[PDB]
Design a protein around this ligand. Structure first.
Ligand code: HEC
Ligand code: HEC
Ligand code: HEC
Ligand code: HEC
Lengths: 181, 181
């Protein structure tokens, strides 16, 4: 269960703590950004990228002065300076073109890319239409991990009589727990 | 709005198309895996990692023969062979220790790491208890991108009278669209 189209494109890149995604018209209108703007959207920053001053909602225009309008082009670029400890960040925020340094005490490394997750034939589109489905998704059931862990509930599990309450008052110990005597 | 604890750990790594996450007791019991098992869980495989034979639900025990039980240790490891085009994959699947080659025609690169997303003071835990919150999450409102794009609706937008229907029959053109005459 894994049919992939001959052109599955990249949905995102992760690099020194920033998640980067193509800046679509969907997203440009959704975040009320100018529609001439070319670059990558940064929607999630942690660790080294957040440290460098980089916030979410920011658009990644360039690195080291070279323009990055696509993921493919942004990767190419991280490969170039992957062994460096610093690269420059040209960013678009609130109409200002800011600059930032990104840092790492070993080396920056290559930004790794992702496609949209593999989906089921009968699956429901949770987002506005964007084009034929095989264009971003692989169709099938592998690349799974289904049922998704997060939707599995754990039986709270046996407790000796007079156990100590780790959690808030939730009700009679006997409703959720199997008691031991 | 960004208070981080002096020990924010890694939640995941992405490497040549696999998303890797610490294999917790939560996840070990949730996927009915042996509880002695040490390694990383692989929950999402695409591109180069899926190509190498790697499926989701798989646990990443080792690379090139070196054991990887934590993210920190798995990164260290990708740094080592980051310039190589091939590394070995020791994996745990259904009780079998399989082996796989991972490949890339330029170079593999460094696996990039992520922490749990920054959360709000008043935010609700969507998962079983796991320990104090500052241990995985940064508390605040930056690293935002809120409101989250996905929860913004776009007004379908004006259509000239006699426009052609791109989408299924949804009802009277006048309910959603502003018509032009
Ligand atoms: C056309 C008929 C479809 C169907 C049935 C689906 N998609 Fe997509 N999809 C894309 C990206 C980048 C995401 C992540 C979320 C986002 O940023 O908007 C998604 C998400 C989904 C889901 C949720 C998947 C999950 O694991 O929860 C599902 C069920 C889904 N899609 C089905 C990317 C694209 C495209 C990129 C240009 C196109 C075209 C489509 N999707 C179209 C469809
Ligand atoms: C203790 C009081 C809390 C609160 C309020 C939250 N967390 Fe966590 N969290 C962790 C990871 C790895 C995730 C991703 C999902 C997963 O794999 O299970 C999450 C998710 C959340 C969310 C959803 C966030 C989102 O962007 O949608 C929220 C609101 C949230 N958490 C709040 C990691 C951990 C831990 C790691 C050991 C611990 C401890 C906690 N979380 C505890 C809390
Ligand atoms: C469901 C409505 C519950 C009621 C009522 C009670 N408990 Fe509970 N408990 C429940 C769950 C789902 C869990 C898992 C952890 C979590 O996220 O809350 C627990 C946990 C405990 C523990 C720790 C378990 C462990 O590490 O093995 C103990 C010792 C415990 N609970 C005891 C307890 C007592 C004494 C209660 C009533 C006076 C009680 N629980 C209520 C679910 C529910
Ligand atoms: C809501 C209940 C709707 C009804 C009824 C109709 N339309 Fe629609 N339309 C709607 C949305 C949210 C969108 C965005 C794209 C999507 O994911 O479906 C659209 C799209 C169109 C388009 C393309 C828009 C563009 O690219 O500019 C056209 C030309 C269009 N719709 C026309 C149309 C006609 C003629 C309808 C009734 C006979 C009609 N729509 C119904 C929402 C809804």
């Amino acid at each position: 269960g894994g049919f992939v189209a001959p052109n599955v494109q990249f949905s995102e890149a992760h690099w020194q703590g920033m998640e980067a995604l193509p800046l679509s018209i969907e997203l440009k209108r959704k975040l009320k950004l100018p529609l001439d703007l070319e670059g990558l959207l940064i929607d999630e920053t942690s660790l080294n990228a957040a440290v460098s001053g980089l916030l979410a909602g920011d658009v990644l225009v360039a690195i080291n002065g070279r323009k990055v309008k696509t993921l493919k082009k942004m990767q190419k670029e991280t490969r170039r300076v992957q062994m460096d400890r610093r690269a420059s960040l040209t960013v678009y925020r609130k109409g200002r073109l800011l600059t930032l340094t990104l840092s790492e005490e070993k080396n920056l490394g290559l930004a790794q890319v992702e496609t949209a997750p593999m989906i089921l034939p009968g699956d429901i589109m949770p987002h506005p239409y964007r084009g034929p489905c095989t264009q971003c998704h692989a169709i099938g059931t592998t690349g799974h991990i289904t049922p998704d862990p997060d939707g599995i509930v754990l039986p709270p599990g046996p407790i000796r009589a007079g156990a100590k309450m780790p959690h808030r008052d939730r009700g009679p110990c006997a409703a959720c727990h199997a008691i031991i005597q």
